[PDB]
């Protein structure tokens, strides 16, 4: 094989295909890219046998058939470490990858492309499109709530589901939960899949406000995202993922509406005021009043009050500072509404202004 093209139409592609991967791969084949040329198109392919990115580049200058597997780290630095504007001529020499940037020519050790483990294709089962930014926010709004290394492996990934003409993701470590729903623009059937950590990360990556409204195809045990030239694909996690509806507080009496940043303060302040961080925050809601004090079990120190809109009995509930703060941050709003019940049962924070997203945080042992 042989092809030649600028250092621009290559670095970007060569950066996205090997972007997620990169390290001390297992077998040498896993840390290698797949270079192919045919019909006047060079196709780069990277994979970690969980997901795989594939860039498509139409070879303008002289091209020629062939399939080789050159290393990734190496092959990228080289082209990335050359005169910006220089052309690169690659040709498969029996068992080496001859490169040429002017006369700055290299030679890479290469394994057969007949050994590459490309996610042997499978059958698509839904598909639809929707602006990146939308498919973006859906992630941002729930990503922080996905477990990290939980033995309940299904939690280590976000869920995606479509029903109606609404796409909604939901993440959860079994202490706090996050949910966001968005309008795609197409009436789609109803299916629900679990995209994993890395996969969500990658999917989040490629997204960047590009004139290529992401196209999505959910399926058997795979899901892919064709965004212009890049085509990210991830396998799915399998297991019963908790029902976001069975956790939402059921008929909560107590309701309160405060200030998004005013509460950030409250909690943030009390957070620092808490020298023994494992004790968490202590909220005391009383008829239109919020005395938020850093829970110091064996102590009574300084706290803060807030002039909020409350209803229901008075109660003091414990809260893991963080869980509450992530929620307030995710809610880039002004006024936050809340729904309580019990000092030992789930709470539902959420923006007042809208209902696109909703969070639920389990209080902590006071």
């Amino acid at each position: 094989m042989k092809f030649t093209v600028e250092r621009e139409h290559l670095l970007k592609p060569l950066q996205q295909v090997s972007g997620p991967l990169g390290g001390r791969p297992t077998l040498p084949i896993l840390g290698n890219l797949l270079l192919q040329v045919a019909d006047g198109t060079l196709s780069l392919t990277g994979t970690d046998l969980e997901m795989e990115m594939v860039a498509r580049v139409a070879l303008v200058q002289p091209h020629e058939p062939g399939a080789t597997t050159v290393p990734a780290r190496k092959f990228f630095d080289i082209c990335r470490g050359l005169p910006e504007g220089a052309e690169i001529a690659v040709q498969l020499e029996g068992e080496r990858m001859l490169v040429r940037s002017g006369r700055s020519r290299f030679s890479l050790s290469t394994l057969p492309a007949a050994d590459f483990p490309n996610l042997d294709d499978w059958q698509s089962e839904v598909e639809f499109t929707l602006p990146q930014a939308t498919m973006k926010r859906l992630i941002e709004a729930t990503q922080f709530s996905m477990a990290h290394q939980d033995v309940r492996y299904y939690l280590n990934g976000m869920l995606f589901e479509t029903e109606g003409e609404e796409l909604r993701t939901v993440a959860t470590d079994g202490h706090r939960l996050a949910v966001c729903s968005m309008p795609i623009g197409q009436s789609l059937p109803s299916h629900s899949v679990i995209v994993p950590r890395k996969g969500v990360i990658e999917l989040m990556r490629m997204l960047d406000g590009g004139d290529n409204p992401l196209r999505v195809q959910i399926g058997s045990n795979n899901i892919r995202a064709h965004v212009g030239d890049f085509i990210f694909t991830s396998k799915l996690v399998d297991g019963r993922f908790p029902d976001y509806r069975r956790v939402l507080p059921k008929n909560p009496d107590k309701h309160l509406e405060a200030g998004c940043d005013l509460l950030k303060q409250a909690f943030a302040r009390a957070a620092a005021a808490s020298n023994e961080k494992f004790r968490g925050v202590r909220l005391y809601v009383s008829e239109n009043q919020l005395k938020i004090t850093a829970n110091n079990p064996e102590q009574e120190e300084a706290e803060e009050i807030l002039d909020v809109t409350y209803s229901g009995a008075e109660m003091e509930i414990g809260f893991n500072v963080s869980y509450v703060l992530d929620v307030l941050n995710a809610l880039k709003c002004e006024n936050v509404r809340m729904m309580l019940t019990d000092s030992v049962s789930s709470v539902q924070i959420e923006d007042a202004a809208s209902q696109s997203a909703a969070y639920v945080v389990m209080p902590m042992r006071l």
């Binding site: 939980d150 470590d173 004790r279 893991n320 389990m362 042992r365």
Partner: protein
């Protein structure tokens, strides 16, 4: 407190989960089995959340504590496994533990894994705090005499017909490493649904099959594979395998390389190679090749001695010597 033995846990674990479990011992298989018996029985009682922490000089104790004070979104109870440092509960560690032995509520079982608690360390604050409100499992590696029956037993509870002789064999080559003996049996088991592990099959299992791990190490030596060789040497003891074995095998391969070396031109590479039933070529061929006889004897002198110390210097590194020695 209840002092128990691995083959008693499942019982005094069925009657009712205690609040904390102390898995104390030097054997790695037994520790892992017991903590599984526990989290298993437990997991079948609402305990669907688990967390493991290593207690060293970096333990972010906050997270551990905050964890205890947490409430599940799916009301699932939780397990917390704590991995003590090699030596035992440190002086500062005795503090944090104490704090935690106090945060032990109910939807929170607790397991502590380590070696026999430093003789007077069972006086520490935290310990006595749990002492009657807990269970203690003693996971010690059985040894020489006691190893056979441990295997004889294990076999039986697998419904296998291990022979008296074959039991001893397995004991001789994996001696000290429970995980190896276990997985060994698991394996022969599948190779013969017949169920009868006769001497021949054990032998065939140890011989013919190259899953006699030290052979992987002795392998790295020939190939002068130091780095990846040390790795194997490491794992080889994170399985509980006793060194008195690695020597005897190499102390042969090596002895051969001497017989081989003493004949580079006495009878050469495929001539004498097609004699001693080793023909590895690239290996024995790399050894004798890249390695000399001035080096060879040092290695034989060394190993010879290393295996004379633990017998005539009993009680208390001399293997990384050989490792790095056969190379550089």
């Amino acid at each position: 407190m209840i002092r128990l033995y691995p083959e008693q846990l499942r019982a005094q674990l069925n009657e009712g989960l205690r609040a904390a479990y102390l898995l104390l011992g030097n054997d790695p298989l037994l520790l892992q089995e017991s903590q599984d018996a526990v989290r298993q029985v437990a997991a079948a009682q609402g305990f669907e959340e688990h967390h493991t922490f290593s207690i060293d000089p970096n333990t972010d104790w906050n997270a551990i504590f905050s964890l205890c004070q947490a409430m599940s979104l799916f009301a699932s109870r939780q397990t917390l496994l704590l991995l003590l440092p090699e030596n035992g509960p440190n002086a500062a560690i005795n503090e944090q533990l104490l704090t935690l032995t106090g945060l032990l509520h109910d939807d929170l079982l607790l397991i502590v894994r380590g070696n026999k608690l430093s003789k007077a360390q069972e006086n520490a604050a935290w310990f006595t705090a749990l002492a009657n409100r807990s269970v203690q499992v003693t996971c010690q590696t059985p040894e020489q005499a006691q190893l056979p029956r441990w295997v004889a037993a294990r076999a039986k509870q697998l419904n296998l017909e291990l022979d008296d002789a074959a039991n001893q064999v397995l004991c001789y080559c994996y001696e000290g490493n429970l995980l190896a003996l276990a997985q060994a049996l698991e394996r022969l088991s599948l190779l013969w649904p017949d169920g009868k592990l006769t001497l021949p099959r054990v032998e065939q299992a140890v011989n013919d099959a190259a899953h006699f791990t030290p052979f992987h190490w002795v392998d790295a030596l020939l190939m002068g594979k130091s780095k990846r060789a040390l790795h194997i040497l490491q794992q080889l003891r994170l399985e509980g395998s006793e060194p008195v074995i690695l020597l005897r095998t190499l102390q042969r391969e090596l002895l051969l390389l001497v017989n081989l070396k003493r004949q580079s031109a006495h009878t050469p590479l495929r001539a004498l190679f097609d004699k001693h039933r080793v023909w590895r070529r690239g290996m024995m061929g790399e050894a004798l090749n890249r390695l000399s006889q001035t080096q060879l004897r040092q290695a034989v002198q060394l190993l010879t001695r290393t295996e004379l110390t633990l017998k005539q210097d009993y009680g208390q590194a001399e293997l990384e010597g050989l490792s790095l020695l056969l190379c550089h």
